[PDB]
């Protein structure tokens, strides 16, 4: 895109201040209209762009997210009632407990039983 | 006993945007002990090129598998993977001022709002019916029999309350509180809960009177980006920029299909069937080819959805 200096310079006949600022602000939008229509057709069928904006794929990622998240909740709710952060404070003094707790969380995220956690002891 | 907490992995720089998950998955699926693939946000400065992490079972070795993919290409570009080593410094430090009476109380106020927003936004659980927001709000109370008497620096109570919110925010929503950042893709990435930021050691000096207010103004100003909704433009500007009407552009599909070969003889190229007038071809497309009329509406909404967003992807 060409800046305000350049567009005014290419109109040396009907040279008004009121008309110049209107036509440049119209040109701005006239150009940015083109860029969006170019960009849409440029990245039309790409999965990242499809997923963010296309109704069918937008619905899928929400369902995929909710299901993966609900499983991450179950882990927190398991760590609560198991009490993996029963005596745990987010402090550098209690750093080794956090790292062990996170590893215990990841195992539950994958879906391992209490027998799987025994290696951390 | 299984070591499921450990998982070794590959890393790939400069993956193309036309490449999807599906076809990276199929490339790595026929290896043994394959788990999952995770791609990052495509950055505009590199022409929207992604960064991938293929994660494996920790038993099966990575260095041979990285070599077996070392000079392989997908779609229209060459991958050249590298071995992604494990995370070094997990439990990181921040300011020691955060272990304070007034500051923890505000951290609990913020953490409540974060969960209130994120729960509603993600569509888990109009007051929030999450148990840790009800059950914790019951606590943080003085309870005394003052009526019966009338007639006759750390605060670990609040910190132990804060930890339950912060650990929920970190574990459930992948939100590192003390760093003030999300890990959005994290659940697919090799390490499911890597970096976590934690309260500092001590505050050496006397805790300054305005410095507690200054910390919160810096801290809350950084948290405000994390709560922000997708910035939709004004319904003028969306229409000006070029919002397509659904019913209008559906009419454009029907008429442009309904071609004329002669006098009272109309064909459409969505079947190969000729009719006696322009009215007969309209009822043919609506009734028999209901799949296409939705397909137009969907791709109109697809283009609209892009225009709706103010903070879009574009070339710098």
Residue numbers in the entry:
A (entry chain A): 149 to 269
B (entry chain C): 413 to 537, 550 to 576, 599 to 762
The publication says:
Here, we describe the crystal structure of the folded core of human ARS2 corresponding to residues 147–270 and 408–763, which are separated by a large unstructured region. We set out to determine the crystal structure of human ARS2 and first worked with the construct ARS2147–763, thus excluding the N- and C-terminal tails predicted to be unstructured. Since crystals of ARS2147–763 only diffracted to around 20 Å resolution, and disorder predictions suggested the presence of an additional central, low-complexity region, limited proteolysis was used to delineate the structured domains. Better crystals (space group P3121), diffracting to 3.7 Å resolution, were obtained by co-expression of two defined fragments denoted as ARS2147–270+408–763 in E. coli. The structure of ARS2147–270+408–763 was solved using selenomethionine-labelled protein and the single-isomorphous replacement with anomalous-scattering (SIRAS) method. The crystallised core, ARS2147–270+408–763, which lacks the central disordered region, retained identical ssRNA binding, whereas for ARS2147–270+494–763, missing the RRM domain as well, no significant RNA binding was detected with concentrations up to 50 µM ARS2 protein. In all crystal structures of hARS2 (except that with loop B deleted), only the first part of the loop is observed with 570-AEEEELL forming helix α10 (‘EEEE helix’). Remarkably, all crystal forms containing loop B, irrespective of space-group, exhibit the same intermolecular crystal contact, in which the acidic ‘EEEE helix’ and the preceding short β-strand pack into the positively charged cradle formed by the RRM β-sheet and the C-terminal extension of the RRM. To accommodate the same intermolecular contact in different crystal-packing environments, some angular flexibility of the loop B structure is required. Crystals of ARS2147–270+408–763Δ568–598 (Δloop B) diffracted to 3.37 Å resolution (space group C2221) and exhibited an ordered loop A. A composite model, including both loop A (from the ARS2147–270+408–763Δ568–598 structure) and most of loop B (from the ARS2147–270+408–763 structure) was artificially constructed and used for illustrative purposes since it is almost complete, only lacking residues 578–598.
